[PDB]
Design a protein around this ligand. Sequence first.
Ligand code: NAD
Ligand code: NAD
Ligand code: ZN
Ligand code: ZN
Lengths: 257, 258
Amino acid sequence: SMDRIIEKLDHGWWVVSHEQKLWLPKGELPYGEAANFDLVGQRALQIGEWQGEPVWLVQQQRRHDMGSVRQVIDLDVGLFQLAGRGVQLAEFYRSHKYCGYCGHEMYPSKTEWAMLCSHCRERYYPQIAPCIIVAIRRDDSILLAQHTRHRNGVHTVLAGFVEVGETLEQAVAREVMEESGIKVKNLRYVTSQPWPFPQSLMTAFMAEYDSGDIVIDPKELLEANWYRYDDLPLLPPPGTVARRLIEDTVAMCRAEY
Amino acid sequence: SMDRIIEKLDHGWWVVSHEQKLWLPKGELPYGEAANFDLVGQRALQIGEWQGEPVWLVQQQRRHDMGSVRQVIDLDVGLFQLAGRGVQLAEFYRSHKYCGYCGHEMYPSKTEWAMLCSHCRERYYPQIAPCIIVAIRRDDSILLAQHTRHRNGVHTVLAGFVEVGETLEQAVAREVMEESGIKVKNLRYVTSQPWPFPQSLMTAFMAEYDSGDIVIDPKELLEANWYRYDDLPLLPPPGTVARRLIEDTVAMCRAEYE
Ligand SMILES: NC(=O)c1ccc[n+]([C@@H]2O[C@H](COP(=O)([O-])OP(=O)(O)OC[C@H]3O[C@@H](n4cnc5c(N)ncnc54)[C@H](O)[C@@H]3O)[C@@H](O)[C@H]2O)c1
Ligand SMILES: NC(=O)c1ccc[n+]([C@@H]2O[C@H](COP(=O)([O-])OP(=O)(O)OC[C@H]3O[C@@H](n4cnc5c(N)ncnc54)[C@H](O)[C@@H]3O)[C@@H](O)[C@H]2O)c1
Ligand SMILES: [Zn+2]
Ligand SMILES: [Zn+2]
């Protein structure tokens, strides 16, 4: 945990963020010495380190080239995760200018990433929202769906935020039943992924069909169907955990059929 | 979401919460009819259903018997999870009376559990803190530690909050490395469990010893060692994630060594 003024001798990867945006001059995550980005004398937070290079967060906005961290998703996974960290932390501090409990103004910790209240005894820590995402397998088929919320002509797997007081398993069961009306069996954890859009922690699952006919919630899904492994529609981009689930499923179907 | 004024014959379980506590008359969860608990004409929120009977949340404090939700942990998993949800929800609403962005007074969503601002478009959802917990295996042995944080003579597994921007995997490797100074491999997710103290979600993991020696920070642990599976010390009570992890680990050892 390092929170200080930037000197000429400071260098590395610079996450310059404001309101869920980051500064991408030339579509690049800023790299190099501080003076080369006019950051000398600017307050900054070291949010990590990638291959010897410190990753910094600067809470300011520029005039041009502000955009989504999704633009730099083709970088090393660890570096992308660190940039996402920058964006999330800036949005956290911005989200806690005032105390939710008593309405007084808050101030940063110096121990950790946290916002402490001057008046009352309350704290906040950056919010990570756990999410489930599951690829459901049926024999030689996988269930894929088009999403109502944002339309893209891409078919993908099922996802949803975990609720308070429920386990990941219950969250998969609940989300799947709510969206498609079917029941699954043989839940299988695969991996997890930080998804700063805005603040989700993905937990990825494989599952098999159990029973029920596909009955969709139109507020969430435009349509959903069983697609055989060999003849697939349009998939989410590689680099996302969704495509990865889809393709573990597919590779498995091929290998087994 | 459902949110109503309580009438004479409303019935079921009553999570009466305020400040990380719930009303536990004579040390049990209030069950029965509204009139029996003076809850008539009060705003309640249906937070779930258990065996047909609704589980309600009332945001008030009684003068006596306000305790920890862990006092009902040994009632079943579902009911305890719902009490946890009630307490956590109460804390959430209390934590978002004012908006952290602008400072104005927020309003509750009618469709979901959320706090909304009419001044700026921002909003908040209940905060769940992802937390890894890991049973580290080394052949027939499993790593057990004693915490300084609470000193009761119970040897349990390692755990730690997941950081912003890190995977569960990275979190396990990290916490293990900081607390014990050993490296792990072959992580296997076991299960998850909500843990309302105040508001975390445990992800239980098993790991195999890769390399390193036990070097601890005393700020976290009083001691830490390798215990063979059939010769265990005192463990956490049955009903916690920790004991499940340890028992499953021992079962695994049982499966590979006898
Ligand atoms: N491959 C991937 O990494 C991948 C794939 C798919 C979805 N995601 C992410 O998983 C999340 C889930 O997406 P979605 O399908 O539900 O659509 P979504 O992003 O629109 O969110 C769904 C709804 O749930 C609610 N919600 C938001 N935050 C919440 C919270 N913290 N707790 C409870 N409810 C909340 C909101 O009403 C939101 O409308 C999104 O961030 C999406 O960005 C990642
Ligand atoms: N059997 C079980 O289920 C079991 C077992 C062991 C520990 N736990 C729980 O796991 C949780 C965390 O593990 P712990 O023992 O290290 O907790 P801890 O509170 O003892 O230590 C974590 C530290 O990080 C801080 N912190 C609090 N919330 C945070 C957040 N959302 N993000 C980042 N930092 C935060 C805390 O102030 C604390 O100082 C605890 O709630 C604990 O009760 C459960
Ligand atoms: Zn306050
Ligand atoms: Zn506001």
